[PDB]
Amino acid sequence: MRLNTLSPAEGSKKAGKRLGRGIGSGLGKTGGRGHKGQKSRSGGGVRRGFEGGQMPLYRRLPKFGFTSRKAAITAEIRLSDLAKVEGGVVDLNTLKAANIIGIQIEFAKVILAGEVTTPVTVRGLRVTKGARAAIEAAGGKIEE
Amino acid sequence: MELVLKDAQSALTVSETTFGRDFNEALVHQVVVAYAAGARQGTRAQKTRAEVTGSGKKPWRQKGTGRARSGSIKSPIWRSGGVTFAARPQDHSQKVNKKMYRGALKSILSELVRQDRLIVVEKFSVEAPKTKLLAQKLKDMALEDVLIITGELDENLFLAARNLHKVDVRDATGIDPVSLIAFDKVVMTADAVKQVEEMLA
Amino acid sequence: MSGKMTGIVKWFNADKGFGFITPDDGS
Amino acid sequence: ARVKRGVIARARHKKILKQAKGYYGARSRVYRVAFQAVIKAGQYAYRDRRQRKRQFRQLWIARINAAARQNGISYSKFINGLKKASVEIDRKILADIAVFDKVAFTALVEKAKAALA
Amino acid sequence: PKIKTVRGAAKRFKKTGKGGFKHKHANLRHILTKKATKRKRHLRPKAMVSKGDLGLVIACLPYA
RNA sequence: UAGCGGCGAGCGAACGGGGAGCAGCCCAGAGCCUGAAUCAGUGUGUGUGUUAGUGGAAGCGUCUGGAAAGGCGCGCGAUACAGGGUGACAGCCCCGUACACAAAAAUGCACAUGCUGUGAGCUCGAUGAGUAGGGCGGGACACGUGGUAUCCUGUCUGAAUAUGGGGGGACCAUCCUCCAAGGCUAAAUACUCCUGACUGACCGAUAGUGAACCAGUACCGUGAGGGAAAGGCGAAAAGAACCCCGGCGAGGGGAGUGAAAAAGAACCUGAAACCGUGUACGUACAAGCAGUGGGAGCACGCUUAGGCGUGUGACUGCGUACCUUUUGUAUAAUGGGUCAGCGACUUAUAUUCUGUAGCAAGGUUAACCGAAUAGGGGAGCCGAAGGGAAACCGAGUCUUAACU
Ligand SMILES: [Mg+2]
Ligand SMILES: [Mg+2]
Ligand SMILES: [Mg+2]
Ligand SMILES: [Mg+2]
Ligand SMILES: [Mg+2]
Ligand SMILES: [Mg+2]
Ligand SMILES: [Mg+2]
Ligand SMILES: [Mg+2]
Ligand SMILES: [Mg+2]
Ligand SMILES: [Mg+2]
Ligand SMILES: [Mg+2]
Ligand SMILES: [Mg+2]
Ligand SMILES: [Mg+2]
Ligand SMILES: [Mg+2]
Ligand SMILES: [Mg+2]
Ligand SMILES: [Mg+2]
Ligand SMILES: [Mg+2]
Ligand SMILES: [Mg+2]
Ligand SMILES: [Mg+2]
Ligand SMILES: [Mg+2]
Ligand SMILES: [Mg+2]
Ligand SMILES: [Mg+2]
Ligand SMILES: [Mg+2]
Ligand SMILES: [Mg+2]
Ligand SMILES: [Mg+2]
Ligand SMILES: [Mg+2]
Ligand SMILES: [Mg+2]
Ligand SMILES: [Mg+2]
Ligand SMILES: [Mg+2]
Ligand SMILES: [Mg+2]
Ligand SMILES: [Mg+2]
Ligand SMILES: [Mg+2]
Ligand SMILES: [Mg+2]
Ligand SMILES: [Mg+2]
Ligand SMILES: [Mg+2]
Ligand SMILES: [Mg+2]
Ligand SMILES: [Mg+2]
Ligand SMILES: [Mg+2]
Ligand SMILES: [Mg+2]
Ligand SMILES: [Mg+2]
Ligand SMILES: [Mg+2]
Ligand SMILES: [Mg+2]
Ligand SMILES: [Mg+2]
Ligand SMILES: [Mg+2]
Ligand SMILES: [Mg+2]
Ligand SMILES: [Mg+2]
Ligand SMILES: [Mg+2]
Ligand SMILES: [Mg+2]
Ligand SMILES: [Mg+2]
């Protein structure tokens, strides 16, 4: 093992195209660009969604809906995340200390995803039905 | 994992996942390349046609004359023109993940064990800061091209090793994979082993 | 002399040419 | 880095200019003409490796037709005689015998006539 | 620099679970008394973007 | 992202979080104690720099060679094997380097202190009016007048004033928070005409500054302004005494120096185009992309004569250049006088896919700290749950009064 015995893995390094260096390279005079277009031009090309002058899809189609600011401050919690806190009690401040939901969060639900194997007191959070059954089966105590 | 010592002919218990790991060459090659790219300074530049000293005047008119069309004397097809894709000062440093860096060190330290390029002693001191004393000690150890890792800051050893190009002396924190490879033998103090094993889990 | 060549190029083209020499509009 | 390409382009031009020896004028002196002439020479050589096999067969046939008419039979009767006599001698060898050993060619003719009669 | 989202397409399309995009139908903004109720009823619900014109949306919406 | 926006092209935050750095004060005013904090200036003193500098280790023999620093032997130094020079590549030849020191004088920065000035603290007050706000017209805020808060103000106006007022994105009410219409203030931040040291997967004379050279010169232009080309004898000039032809020439032949003069100043190496001298072969009854396949003869070498090579090439079959653009070019379509040198899919940041590698329901850090490619740092980002415009529900959800 010296510096002149190392060699990388197979397929790691691929050579990369070099346009405009002869016939045999394949990428000859035009370099994958064809002939006499706008696309073959330097900097040429059309912008996103341009269909010719046809009305693009993002303007044929209507806008809909609005954006809820409250959704940004809500969060969903796995059952598998309940063990990552300490003390066996689950609050917002506990989850934020465990770096699960984030600081600006003011609302959280617990969702049947994953599974928990320990009694955990849930306090001040919404709980789904399957998470309520799984918590109460593992010994939990859902409160407010 | 047990490392026999050179001088007192004792053993030293280490982690086998650290000093008996199989050699992952592609990982080590990635890390050694990124180290040598991190050393790379990247200080160069050329001038574009924007940056060439000149004037933005057409050397001749567009038509009528028999010559080719031209718009600028700074053109990268002219003599003393610009460079077409003139370079800028760029940073060639690569990211290496932490677990990939430690996987590489655990690989090549395992390989130096399997190649018997690793020597472990209890202590490695030179009394006075003299290169004559250090060369005598390494001749008595039958060593010429060596890296010497010490778990302490020994100044007499640093000074006595500063003039010898075959010899380099590091702290256990300041070890690098390319130097663990570029040197023929590596001498580790047993304390430096304990620190390296602790850092590398 | 390529500086006397500067004259050469700079103004044996700035002589500007007179023009076509056939009164013909191919019209 | 600035790769300076004088050595490579010189040796690349001299590989062509060596192949263009004997050519008239700039075809042996000038890379632009010589390269254009070397390629055509490779084209002709590819072509005339095929045409060699035609032209010698044509020569052999004309010599057999002459020597057979010297022995009083045409080529088309003579090949048909040797096919019906199963003689699988190719017409290189028949032209060689027609030049150097006319007795054996006469014997081949009489074998072919006996194969036709 | 970062890519900028085409904000009209961001107001017109939403990414679903498997990566497809939902969108509102057209023809349901005015001129509605002459259209059959069956047509409108089949235009109220959101539809998925087809496979052909899904590439231009992804190009316009790189950030989902 | 939220938003703004012919809701187009595009513009694009903030709250909040992590960090670098952190410093607070004064007048709108009287007193009381009086010089009290601090700052400024000016002296002195001390320290630390700067502006000249000093010392600074250790090698000989032999071989080749013009010349040793090279080779082969045998030693020595090293807190100095950074670098450069020396007749070829020098740790020990020189200059230096590591390290150790050094300033009559001037000056910077710190402290300290003297002097000068400066006021400190306590009490009771006071609390910045053509101002805020408003109307009109504009501008700035990510916010294009929109439902548009807030800021500025050209114009017309115009408050209350601590029981008061401003803001919390039209607006009102409640609540919270702050006190405008007077000022000062270090740091972290930005840059480099210039100086010093060092560095480079930067260039090496058509490159790199326009400029390696008496270059912003020569030259051009009325002028502003534009703006070049051009490096190398040799280790050392030892740069050719003298002789000869020649015009008391140029230039050259000798001689001489030198390792070398096919290193002689038009000077390292000296390619190609281009132009010549010499030799071999062919060529003056013969028609065309000039070659190719065959092939006689001639000349020349080798050779066991064996016949191969090499050069030429009488004659002969076939055979209308290259590029580009084109339905399609020998095309009488474009382009190129030739050579040599340069000359065109890059770079940065985002994103997706593939491959590869690491960890794996987890993966990963950025800024920054750190002497430092380590380690720390998990702020955050992506992912493991979605549906719905949304509230919301949740392995389901939406639609719908409800779904077979
Ligand atoms: Mg192709
Ligand atoms: Mg083209
Ligand atoms: Mg076309
Ligand atoms: Mg095209
Ligand atoms: Mg362009
Ligand atoms: Mg139209
Ligand atoms: Mg967090
Ligand atoms: Mg102009
Ligand atoms: Mg120039
Ligand atoms: Mg240039
Ligand atoms: Mg790190
Ligand atoms: Mg180079
Ligand atoms: Mg020639
Ligand atoms: Mg409607
Ligand atoms: Mg000295
Ligand atoms: Mg010395
Ligand atoms: Mg030499
Ligand atoms: Mg006030
Ligand atoms: Mg106002
Ligand atoms: Mg208002
Ligand atoms: Mg106004
Ligand atoms: Mg007003
Ligand atoms: Mg206000
Ligand atoms: Mg409000
Ligand atoms: Mg104020
Ligand atoms: Mg230059
Ligand atoms: Mg040169
Ligand atoms: Mg003048
Ligand atoms: Mg003379
Ligand atoms: Mg010359
Ligand atoms: Mg030389
Ligand atoms: Mg020369
Ligand atoms: Mg020549
Ligand atoms: Mg003749
Ligand atoms: Mg003749
Ligand atoms: Mg003719
Ligand atoms: Mg032949
Ligand atoms: Mg062309
Ligand atoms: Mg045409
Ligand atoms: Mg075509
Ligand atoms: Mg046409
Ligand atoms: Mg044709
Ligand atoms: Mg013609
Ligand atoms: Mg033509
Ligand atoms: Mg044309
Ligand atoms: Mg032409
Ligand atoms: Mg990519
Ligand atoms: Mg990958
Ligand atoms: Mg369903």
DSSP for E13-56, written as a single string: EEE-TTS-EEE--SS-SS--SSS-HHHHHTTSS-EEPPSGGGHH
Task: List B168's β-bridge partners, or say none.
Answer: B147
CB A101 within 8 A of CB A75: yes
Structure tokens at A73: 């401050």
CB D1 within 8 A of CB B85: no
Structure tokens at D110: 């009489």
Domain enclosing residue B40, as ranges: 2-200
Which among B71, B72, B68 has a CA at the least distance from the CA of B80? B72
For A1, which of B26, B30, B181 is closest by C-beta distance? B181
What whole-number distance in Å separates Cα of residue E60 and Cα of residue B121?
64
What whole-number distance in Å separates Cα of residue A29 and Cα of residue A21?
8
Q: Give the 3-state DSSP-derived string for chain B, with helices as H, strands as E and coil as C.
A: CECCCCCCCCCCECCHHHHCCCCCHHHHHHHHHHHHHHCCCCCCCCCCCCCCCCCCCCCCCCCCCCCCCCCCCCCCCCCCCCCCCCCCCCCCCCCCCHHHHHHHHHHHHHHHHHCCCEEEECCCCCCCCCHHHHHHHHHHCCCCCEEEEECCCCHHHHHHHCCCCCEEEEECCCCCHHHHHHCCEEEEEHHHHHHHHHHCC
Which residues in chain C touch residue B65, judged by CB atoms under 8 angstroms apart? 13, 17
Count of Cβ atoms closer than 10 Å to residue B60 Cβ: 17
Which among A74, A76, A71, A72 has a CA at the least distance from the CA of A106? A74
Q: Coil, helix or strand for E7?
A: helix
Which residues in chain A touch residue E13, judged by CB atoms under 8 angstroms apart? 58, 61
Structure tokens at B62: 């567009």
Structure tokens at B164: 């010898």
Structure tokens at B33: 């390349």
Task: List A141's β-bridge partners, or say none.
Answer: A121
What whole-number distance in Å separates Cα of residue B177 and Cα of residue B179?
5
Q: Count of CB contacts below 8 A, A vs E?
A: 43
CATH number of the domain to which B106 belongs: 3.40.1370.10
What whole-number distance in Å separates Cα of residue A85 and Cα of residue A116?
12
CB B21 within 8 A of CB B110: yes
Nucleotide nearest to D7 (CA to C1'): F271
Residue B5, class by beta-carbon neighbours within 10 Å (0-12 exposed, 13-18 middle, 19+ buried)? middle
Please, what sign has the CA dihedral across residues B124, B128, B129, B135? negative
What whole-number distance in Å separates Cα of residue B101 and Cα of residue B94?
12
What whole-number distance in Å separates Cα of residue B160 and Cα of residue B126?
8
CB B170 within 8 A of CB B148: yes
Displacement of CA D9 from its chain's centroid (Å) = 37
Strands B185-189 and B118-121: parallel
What whole-number distance in Å separates Cα of residue A55 and Cα of residue D113?
89
Which residues in chain B touch residue C13, judged by CB atoms under 8 angstroms apart? 60, 65, 67
Q: Could you tell me the distance, in angstroms and rounded to a whole number, from the CA of residue A41 to the centre of ligand 4?
A: 9
Structure tokens at C12: 């044996």
- State yes or no: chains C and A have 3 or more CB pairs below 8 A: no
Nucleotide nearest to A133 (CA to C1'): F394
Contact (CB<8Å) A62/E26: yes
Q: Which residue of B has its CA nearest to C16?
A: B65
Q: Which long-range contacts (CB under 8 A, 24 or more apart) does C17-22 make?
A: C17/B64, C17/B65
Displacement of CA C4 from its chain's centroid (Å) = 17
Q: Which of B60, B61, B65, B80 to mutate to test the interface with C (most CBs of C within 10 A)?
A: B65
Q: Does B67 touch chain C (CB under 8 A)?
A: yes
Half-sphere exposure of D87 (CA within 13 A, CB side): 21
Which among B14, B12, B3 has a CA at the least distance from the CA of B201? B14
Structure tokens at D48: 């005339």
- State yes or no: chains C and E have 3 or more CB pairs below 8 A: no
Q: Give me the phi and psi of B150, to 5 degrees please.
A: -130, 135
Nucleotide nearest to A33 (CA to C1'): F345
**Header resolution in angstroms:** 3.0
Residues with CB under 5 A from ligand 4 (ion): A 34, 37, 39
Strands E21-23 and E47-48: antiparallel
Count of Cβ atoms closer than 10 Å to residue B37 Cβ: 13
Q: Give me the phi and psi of B126, to 5 degrees please.
A: -120, 135
* b/e code B169-200 from CB counts within 10 Å (16+ = b): bbebeebebbebbebebbbbbbebbebbbeeb
What whole-number distance in Å separates Cα of residue B113 and Cα of residue B188?
12
Q: Which residue of C has its CA nearest to B65?
A: C13
Q: How many domains does chain B have?
A: 1
Q: Could you tell me the distance, in angstroms and rounded to a whole number, from the CA of residue B200 to the centre of ligand 11?
A: 15
Which among D54, D117, D112, D63 has a CA at the least distance from the CA of D86? D112
Strands E21-23 and E13-15: antiparallel
Please, which residues 49-108 of chain A have a Cβ atom closer than 8 Å to chain E? 49, 51, 56-64
CB A71 within 8 A of CB A104: no
Q: Which residue of B has its CA nearest to C13?
A: B65
Q: Which long-range contacts (CB under 8 A, 24 or more apart) does A120-129 make?
A: A120/A82, A120/A83, A120/A85, A120/A88, A120/A89, A120/A90, A121/A88, A121/A89, A121/A90, A122/A82, A122/A90, A123/A89, A123/A90, A123/A91, A124/A91, A124/A92, A125/A77, A125/A90, A125/A91, A125/A92
Displacement of CA A133 from its chain's centroid (Å) = 30
Cα dihedral D18→D22→D28→D34 (10° resolution): -80
Helix (H) / strand (E) containing D91:
helix D91-100
Nucleotide nearest to A27 (CA to C1'): F345
- State yes or no: chains D and A have 3 or more CB pairs below 8 A: no
What whole-number distance in Å separates Cα of residue D3 and Cα of residue A57?
50
Strands A74-77 and E13-15: unpaired
What whole-number distance in Å separates Cα of residue B190 and Cα of residue B12?
8
Residue A112, class by beta-carbon neighbours within 10 Å (0-12 exposed, 13-18 middle, 19+ buried)? middle
CATH number of the domain to which A100 belongs: 3.100.10.10
What whole-number distance in Å separates Cα of residue A110 and Cα of residue A127?
5
Q: Does B123 touch chain C (CB under 8 A)?
A: no
Contact (CB<8Å) E12/A58: yes
A32 vs A14, A28, A144, C14, CA distance in Å? 18, 8, 65, 43
Structure tokens at E31: 């001129």
Count of Cβ atoms closer than 10 Å to residue A135 Cβ: 24
Cα dihedral D27→D29→D33→D39 (10° resolution): 70
Which among D95, D89, D99 has a CA at the least distance from the CA of D59? D95
Count of Cβ atoms closer than 10 Å to residue B51 Cβ: 13
Helices D75-84 and D102-116 sit at what angle, rounded to 10 degrees? 70
Gap from E41 CA to F403 C1', Å: 16
